[PDB]
Design a protein around this ligand. Sequence first.
Ligand SMILES: [Ca+2]
Ligand SMILES: [Ca+2]
Length: 163
Amino acid sequence: ETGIGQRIVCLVLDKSGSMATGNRLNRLNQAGQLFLLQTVELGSWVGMVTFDSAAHVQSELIQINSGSDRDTLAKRLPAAASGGTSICSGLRSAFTVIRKKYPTDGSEIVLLTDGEDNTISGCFNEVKQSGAIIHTVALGPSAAQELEELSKMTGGLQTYASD
Ligand SMILES: [Ca+2]
Ligand SMILES: [Ca+2]
């Protein structure tokens, strides 16, 4: 969080090729819309990051004050799915997006992925040293175990929005 009690949240969104299967991308967008348009509260600082082989910053941290702010972020939800998969590119970039303004300790990630990635241990340390809180939504049924181990090691929640 920010020193005065404002939330810091960075959406981290799996646009990789496996996400074109079934309705994963639709379920990604639906939860991204819900979190953006209804859930996250006034005053919060919110960034957005998509990722395939690598990360693409859809937005730096902007503060939620108007419905404009919500619609802007929501319009940047991934359109289609393509490319390689590297969850760590996104978390690394999330931590960079945050640390342009605030420390990662106490901040929150919202990792929307199907979990089909087996290099996740690659960033365990940095994920630990960040102090961030990685909530995860599993959008497929074949999520790697290190996806769960990301929330477990950071204090974040896990929910499963597949079928
Ligand atoms: Ca607090
Ligand atoms: Ca994938």
